[PDB]
RNA sequence: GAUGAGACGCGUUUUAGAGCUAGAAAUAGCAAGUUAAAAUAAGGCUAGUCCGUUAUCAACUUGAAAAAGUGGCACCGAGUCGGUGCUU
DNA sequence: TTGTACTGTAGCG
DNA sequence: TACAGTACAA
């Protein structure tokens, strides 16, 4: 009557099995629908579900974010066009239209082919006068005469579109960029640090002595040569090296006294970077980025003509290969091909080594300066303030000439400078799953009127309530920051409570250790404890400490940070100010923009003010903690009256750890956790947590349990065995769904007992008693693993059977089911291919013909559709009937599901029989002659779908033949396995014949069969190890799935691809259930 | 560790940046090249500076959909399950 | 003009 | 690893 179900859940597989109380898997005659002759097939209640891995939403999030960025960039361009329209439309009637249709071929182009002027003479004059955009930018900055309005528009449109980063706040100044002033500040703070023997010095000429011309290690002698009173190994060399990112010997040169020197060295380093990002830097006043790129263009031109002359005169061989070929990573490949800067350097670098006199040019490669482009991967560090200043200079230079620039200077500057804040989110109207913003009005949001439309308080508060995460130990409670005061003091006390001294720590000792050392220094080591506390206070000469090895991993960074921003130390040591300080760290963790942070902290202005506020406004914290206030110093024990944290302060002689406070059942804390932890099936799965790779596994195993209950007359099991983010989720749902009855005195009736097991027990059961398994032979190991889970679980709850378990491990019929997916994702591969005459190119837009504009390729098929119809064939037309599959792609999926009939007559199929349209997803199973099974991978690709059910004794033979000397058991057992597997060595020559029969029956890969037979015969004499590993990889030939290229000793066998789905037109399609015990067999040969 | 927000720089694609000479030419020699526009999932309607690659999905009967319903047992054996016997 | 075989295709920090 | 591009059998 009663039965048990065993499960084994993985990321790609869910194994399931039914056992009785006699450890036997039942077999039942299952009814089969469809038009086939078969009405009932005998099936066993053991099998496994195979499925695709569940993906995280990350890639979707990146594509979403990028798509928003492109939309907003186009919107900025549209805003600038709207500003220009009223005047420039009088200047040039069709300028924006030409810039819009610049992409089109001339025959699609309604207006003239030249985008800017529309006349060839003025376009050539523009390109001669301004070969790059930077020349036009620099002229518009540096010219006082009346300029043409369209060129002004290209300048600001280039500047607004490609606007640079916002990693630096506020405005730029030479006080941060010019290295000399921060060097003066750094030497000033060093001198006030010691004042005995200072190196007093003026500013430094960093343009040679610290930037790329003598950067990194070279500055440690170049700058030292101007100040020989200090040295490269000295502390001045130390600060310069720290200003160059090196690791100097701080311990040899020498407390938070030196932290000022460290931070000033870091800001000096920042000054060198903002100097070196621009070539000209301080060498000229006008248009610094435009000037830098014009200089780069001039240097590129002269070095290019030098390089061409030198190649043409001294080594004319491969002159065409460099400058004409455009395929072998030459200069023509650098410009007209897809060769990077470093690839072009790497191509000509052995060349330049071979040629003579290249030294003056090769250093430009060694400095990465040679023939650089103006649009490069290195432009990512360009701040937006440079473009802002350039745009401001252009509008101030043309303010009086064009009045609408004077009326809209702040408008254009706001278009460039506006950033949607971290906390506002998307500017939706409720039609977004992600948006949380609250409007204070119902109108269009522009950057000019952003500050009077969004309710920043309500949007901010919603942002707090969404972004806050919730505690793993109690999911209803808000987490603290990882940089919270109580979080750091929690982990400091939790690390300190496991320290034992020999001459455990008591409460007063721990409190004094924290008050004299942890609340004084960032890093505390064992030597500091035994020297500054035990000898100083406890008067202990010799102390041995075993709790901590070298130093404490936890530290009070946040405490000393607050002690830095305000020096009112007793205020930090006051328990009344704890919640206020928690609110500040909650403020800086959540927000990154200065405005709303300023609004939140301004409430506390009546406690402290001025310099402390202006200082603390620059601090920011990142990350979030794993614990809540309501657990650390929250719930209280009934008998002791102490929390987690109160127990951490004092626990008598034996000190108890947070995990062991949870683990101990003698307190009410476990009860307090479990009574508060608890918080349609689709509605029930819609809220659960965990990684996507395992959530799929849980949902599919509960569905498998649903189908299994449906099979067995709705009778419940006696117990269900479950394998071990998911640590209670493994049981949670199935306890809730099986156990649905309760009484007034019994809180829950245990009709089904959910038994939890670890993989160590089942693996040890397998390793001890010769019931071995491998992954390469077949996917029967999942079902065998689950059935073994059921066996051991029932045996342990209860506590010829060995013959039964060996027979079940050697039963051939196991219901392997590959779950059938409609494919979802991007409908094509992302590389845009160039123009071609092929019709296979996918159009990138509705009006862009891919024969002229290129397009995408490799489309993805969501599912295939079997159609029977008449197709127009032949010059002398007649209507021939045909049955064939057609692959529906992801882009055509919706258009197919709106009206399948019209979509099929769009493709050439007429007189389509509508009722015989069958939907075939990926991994649709077809059966053919001699039991050959083929799996539909696409409309024009099949896959292997048959299992080689090799008897268990030979699988034992293969496992023992491998791992020949790495058992790590006992010598008697190891030598017994070796001699016992040597006594069966003829199993090798029988298993190769097993492979031959099964592959000749259902794989049909005869050339590959002869290849592996010849390679086996000519490698017969090699020993057990490497032979026994190569037969393991030959099961790739017989394994279900796509045909992969496996490899023998030396030869590599290419896969045999089944690129023909014509044979499944007459096969028997199997509609297999999630457990596969119910099937619907349709004989497609009777259709059409 | 799941999950979200805001940004930047590249890349790709088509076009614009007049190629010259010898040429019946299939072409040969030379010059030139660094930049810009437009798009970056086709598109969708509640038209938002929003959404569109995450999750979900055997077949049949009801139901717009949600969702519900849809398939006997015992024994002997085992090449992807077969056979024997009761039952409506 | 239609099927097969072999090799190459794939946008990130 | 599904699909593309080129190269042959009829």
Swiss-Prot record:
Motif PAM substrate-binding: where? Answer: 1055-1057
The record's region (PAM-interacting domain (PI)) falls at: 821-1088
Assigned keywords, A-Z: Antiviral defense, DNA-binding, Endonuclease, Exonuclease, Hydrolase, Magnesium, Manganese, Metal-binding, Nuclease, RNA-binding
Mutation: residue 854 to C; reported impact is: Probably inactivates protein
Q: Where does Mn(2+) 3 bind?
A: 1019, 1050
Where on this chain does Mn(2+) 1 bind? Answer: 8, 723
- Give the Gene3D superfamilies listed for this entry: 1.10.30.50, Ribonuclease H-like superfamily/Ribonuclease H (3.30.420.10)
Positions of region (RuvC-II): 680-724
Outcome after substituting residue 13 to A: Decreased DNA cleavage
Please state what the protein is called. CRISPR-associated endonuclease Cas9/Csn1
Checking NCBIfam families in the record gives:
cas_Csn1 (TIGR01865)
Q: How is it used?
A: Coexpression of Cas9 with an artificial single guide RNA (sgRNA) which fuses the crRNA with the tracrRNA in human cells has shown it is possible to target and modify DNA sequences of interest. Cas9 plus the 2 sgRNAs have also been expressed individually in human and mouse cells to achieve DNA targeting; cleavage efficiencies of the artificial sgRNA were lower that those for systems with the 2 sgRNAs expressed separately. Microinjection of Cas9-encoding mRNA and a synthetic sgRNA into zebrafish embryos induces targeted mutations.
What is any Pfam family matched here? HNH_4
UniProt record, GO biological process: defense response to virus; maintenance of CRISPR repeat elements
Specify where the region named Recognition lobe lies, as residue ranges.
Answer: 54-679
Q: Which family does it belong to?
A: Belongs to the CRISPR-associated protein Cas9 family. Subtype II-A subfamily.
| Upper classification of the organism | Bacteria, Bacillati, Bacillota, Bacilli, Lactobacillales
Q: Which cofactors is this protein said to need?
A: Mg(2+)
**UniProt xrefs under InterPro entries:** Cas9, Cas9-BH, Cas9_PI, Cas9_REC, Cas9_RuvC, HNH_CAS9, HNH_nuc, RNaseH_sf
Q: What is the effect of changing residue 68 to A?
A: No DNA cleavage
Entry EC no(s): 3.1.-.-
Specify which residues bind Mn(2+) 2 according to the UniProt entry for this protein: 8, 782
Uppermost EC category:
hydrolase
What species was this sequence derived from? Streptococcus pyogenes serotype M1
* GO terms, molecular function: 3'-5' exonuclease activity; DNA binding; DNA endonuclease activity; metal ion binding; RNA binding
């Amino acid at each position: 009557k009663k039965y048990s179900i065993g499960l084994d859940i993985g990321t790609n597989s869910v194994g399931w099995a039914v056992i009785t109380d006699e450890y036997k898997v039942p077999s039942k005659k299952f009814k089969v629908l469809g038009n086939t002759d078969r009405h009932s097939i005998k099936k066993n209640l053991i099998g496994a579900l195979l499925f695709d891995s569940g993906e995280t939403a990350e890639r979707t999030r990146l594509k979403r974010t990028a798509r928003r960025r492109y939309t907003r960039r186009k919107n900025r361009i549209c805003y600038l066009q709207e500003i220009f329209s009223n005047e420039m439309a009088k200047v040039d009637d069709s300028f924006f239209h030409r810039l819009e249709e610049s992409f089109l071929v001339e025959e699609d182009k309604k207006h003239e082919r030249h985008p800017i002027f529309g006349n060839i003479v003025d376009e050539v004059a523009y390109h001669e006068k301004y070969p790059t955009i930077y020349h036009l930018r620099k002229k518009l900055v540096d010219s006082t005469d009346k300029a043409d309005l369209r060129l002004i528009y290209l300048a600001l449109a280039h500047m607004i579109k490609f606007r640079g980063h916002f990693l630096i706040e506020g405005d730029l100044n030479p006080d941060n960029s010019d290295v000399d002033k921060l060097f003066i500040q750094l030497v000033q703070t060093y001198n006030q640090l010691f004042e005995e023997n200072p190196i007093n010095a003026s500013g430094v000429d960093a343009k040679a002595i610290l930037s790329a011309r003598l950067s990194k290690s070279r500055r440690l002698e170049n700058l030292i040569a101007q100040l020989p009173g200090e040295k490269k190994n000295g502390l001045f060399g130390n600060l310069i090296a720290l200003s160059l990112g090196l690791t100097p010997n701080f311990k040899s040169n020498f407390g938070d006294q030196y932290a000022d020197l460290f931070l000033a060295a870091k800001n000096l380093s920042d000054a060198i970077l903002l100097s070196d990002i621009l070539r000209v830097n301080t060498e000229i006043t006008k248009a610094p980025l435009s000037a830098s790129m014009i200089k780069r263009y001039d240097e590129h031109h002269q070095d290019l003509t030098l390089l061409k002359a030198l190649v043409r005169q001294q080594l004319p061989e491969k002159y065409k290969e460099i400058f004409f070929d455009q395929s072998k990573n030459g200069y023509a490949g650098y410009i007209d091909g897809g060769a990077s800067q470093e690839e072009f350097y790497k191509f000509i670098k052995p060349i330049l080594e071979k040629m003579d006199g290249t030294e003056e040019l090769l250093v430009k490669l060694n400095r990465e300066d040679l023939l650089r482009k103006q649009r490069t991967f290195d432009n990512g560090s360009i701040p937006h303030q440079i473009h802002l200043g350039e745009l401001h200079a252009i509008l101030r230079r043309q303010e009086d000439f064009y009045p609408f620039l004077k009326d809209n200077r702040e408008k254009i500057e706001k278009i460039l400078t506006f950033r949607i804040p971290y906390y506002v989110g998307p500017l939706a109207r409720g039609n977004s799953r992600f948006a949380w913003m609250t409007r204070k009005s119902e109108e269009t949001i522009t950057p000019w009127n952003f500050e009077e439309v969004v309710d920043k308080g309500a949007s901010a508060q919603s942002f707090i309530e969404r972004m806050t995460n919730f505690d793993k130990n109690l999911p209803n409670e808000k987490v603290l920051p990882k940089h919270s005061l109580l979080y750091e003091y929690f982990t400091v006390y939790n690390e300190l409570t496991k320290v034992k001294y020999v001459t455990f720590l008591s409460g007063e000792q721990k409190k004094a250790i924290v008050d004299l050392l942890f609340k004084t220094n960032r890093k505390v080591t064992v030597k500091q404890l035994k020297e500054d506390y035990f000898k100083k206070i406890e008067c202990f000469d010799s102390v041995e400490i075993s709790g901590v090895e070298d130093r404490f991993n936890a530290s009070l960074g946040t405490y000393h940070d607050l002690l830095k921003i305000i020096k009112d130390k007793d205020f930090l040591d006051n328990e009344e100010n704890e919640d206020i300080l928690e609110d500040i760290v909650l403020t800086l963790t959540l927000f990154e923009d200065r405005e709303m942070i300023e609004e939140r902290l301004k409430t506390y202005a009546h406690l402290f003010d001025d310099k402390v506020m202006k200082q603390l406004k620059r601090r920011r914290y990142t990350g979030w903690g794993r614990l809540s206030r309501k657990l650390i110093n929250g719930i209280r024990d009934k008998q002791s009256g102490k929390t987690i944290l109160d127990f951490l302060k004092s626990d008598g002689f034996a000190n108890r750890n947070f995990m062991q406070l949870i683990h101990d059942d003698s307190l009410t804390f476990k009860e307090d956790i479990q009574k508060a932890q608890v918080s349609s099936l689709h509605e029930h799965i819609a809220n659960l947590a965990g990684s996507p790779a395992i959530k799929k596994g849980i949902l599919q195993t509960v569905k498998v349990v649903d189908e299994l209950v449906k099979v067995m007359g709705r009778h419940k099991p006696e117990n269900i065995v479950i394998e071990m983010q998911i640590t209670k989720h493994v049981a949670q749902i199935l306890d809730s769904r099986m156990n649905t009855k309760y009484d007034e005195n019994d809180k829950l009736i245990r009709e089904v007992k959910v038994i939890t097991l670890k993989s160590k027990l089942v693996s040890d059961f397998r390793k001890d008693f010769q019931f071995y398994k491998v992954r390469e032979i077949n996917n029967y190991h999942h079902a065998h693993d689950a059935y073994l889970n059921a066996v051991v679980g029932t045996a342990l709850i209860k506590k010829r059977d060995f013959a039964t378990v060996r027979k079940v491990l050697s039963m051939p019929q196991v219901n392997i089911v590959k779950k059938t997916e409609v494919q979802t994702g991007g409908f094509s591969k992302e590389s845009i291919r160039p123009k071609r005459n092929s019709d296979k190119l996918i159009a990138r837009k509705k009006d862009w013909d891919p024969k002229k504009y290129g397009g995408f390729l490799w489309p993805t098929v969501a599912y295939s559709v079997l159609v029977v119809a008449k197709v127009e064939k032949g010059k002398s037309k007649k209507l021939k009937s045909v049955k064939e599959l057609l692959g529906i792609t992801i882009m055509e999926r919706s258009s197919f599901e709106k009206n399948p009939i019209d979509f099929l007559e769009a493709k050439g199929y007429k007189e389509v029989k509508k009722d015989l349209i069958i939907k075939l997803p990926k991994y649709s199973l077809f059966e053919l002659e001699n039991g050959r099974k083929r799996m539909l991978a696409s409309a024009k690709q099949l896959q292997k779908g048959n299992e080689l059910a090799l008897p268990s004794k030979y699988v034992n033979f293969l496992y023992l033949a491998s791992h020949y000397e790495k058992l790590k058991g006992s010598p008697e057992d190891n030598e017994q396995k070796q001699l016992f597997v040597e006594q069966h060595k003829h199993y090798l020559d029988e298993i190769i014949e097993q492979i031959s029969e099964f592959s000749k029956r259902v794989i049909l890969a005869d050339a590959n069969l002869d290849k592996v037979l010849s390679a086996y015969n000519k490698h017969r004499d090699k020993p057990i190890r490497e032979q026994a590993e190569n037969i393991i990889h030959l099961f790739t030939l017989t394994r279900l799935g796509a045909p992969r290229a496996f490899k023998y000793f030396d030869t590599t066998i290419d896969p045999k691809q089944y690129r023909s789905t014509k044979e499944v037109l007459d096969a028997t399609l199997i509609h297999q259930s999630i457990t596969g015990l119910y099937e619907t067999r349709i004989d497609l040969s009777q259709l059409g």
